[PDB]
Design a protein around this nucleic acid. Structure first.
Ligand code: NA
Lengths: 175, 180
DNA sequence: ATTTCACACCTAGGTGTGAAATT
DNA sequence: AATTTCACACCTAGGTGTGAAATT
């Protein structure tokens, strides 16, 4: 196939993956960091597509953080990228960033993807053809972006990188 | 026809309009206030459309504000609404607000609309069918939203209404409510 | 007469913190 | 004790008119 989906900023994602990544989930929705950003080529530049994001279990068991390490102890709803629907040229000319998806531990509203806390999840992206002869769906999972949903950060080394890179955490970037 | 396009918050618009509305233009682009919003019905909920905004000259005069009144003394580039392209159901389920369009006097390529200062303009919206059997471009002009592009507000009565309704001007609101 | 621009002051909201609540 | 919640200080990000200054 012509389609090519690449995870942008993989170096940054692997820095979090190494220490086991954590994404805060809140009742009101919490943005991800790092932000999932995808590079796409191979779409028809003049065809219409919608990008979808959901979250798949990365394993089967509940997780627990004890003594500085992670120990064992259903697919989410889908989020539509706010640029959808759009032509393939739009999706290809710049990386598709899911900067506005919010993760939550309660089904309290729309636009927020509910996650079960202390479980490992893998982001999965779907490219949906809009108005073609037939339905085209492609799935793309990125192992580098696996994480455990938490209500509070467990590994402080993750907290440090979150502070180091998320501009919204700049006030804590003193140390 | 089936299509129906009407202006949201027309009452607010006509408050500026009967004073002679004014829109600041800057080098880096200035958002409009009030924001142009339209209610759409009659579109095919499953067909694809884009919404386009441009500005047509409301007359041939240059304009001048002297002693508390206005006096005599080419269509713009088009702004594509950020929700474009989208299904008719998306356009119809809520007003189409052009809250992010920026008006400038120095066209420097940032997606902003260059206008001529001290000229009178009328927002004009275009609904364009996206990838149908054939073209469909409608146009809708809203006489209520006519305005004069300015580098600085001339009519303080207009400035007061900006301060009263634009929440980004809230810092000046209390002193304005104590006037007259 | 007209345009420019740094500025204070806002809207709007995204961070981790840490005390507290919940279990 | 493990986990969740929440008000908070502190930021990013950027939209206002003001009025002193600059430009014509
Ligand atoms: Na400009």
């Amino acid at each position: 196939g012509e389609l090519r989906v690449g995870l942008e900023e993989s170096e940054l994602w692997l820095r979090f993956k190494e220490l086991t990544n954590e994404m805060i989930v809140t009742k009101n929705g919490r943005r991800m960091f790092p932000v999932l950003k995808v590079n796409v080529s191979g779409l028809d530049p003049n065809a219409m597509y919608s990008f979808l994001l959901d979250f798949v279990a990365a394993d089967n068991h509940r997780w627990k953080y004890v003594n500085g390490e992670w120990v064992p102890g259903a697919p989410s709803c889908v989020y539509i990228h706010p640029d959808s629907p759009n032509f393939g040229a739009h999706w290809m000319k710049a990386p598709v960033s899911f900067s506005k998806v919010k993760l939550t531990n309660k089904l309290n509203g729309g636009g927020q993807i509910m996650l079960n806390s202390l479980h490992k999840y893998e982001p999965r992206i779907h490219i949906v053809r809009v108005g073609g002869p037939q339905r085209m769906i492609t799935s793309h999972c990125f192992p580098e972006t696996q994480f455990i949903a938490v209500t509070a950060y467990q590994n402080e080394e993750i907290t440090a990188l979150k502070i180091k890179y998320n501009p919204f955490a700049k006030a804590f970037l003193d140390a």
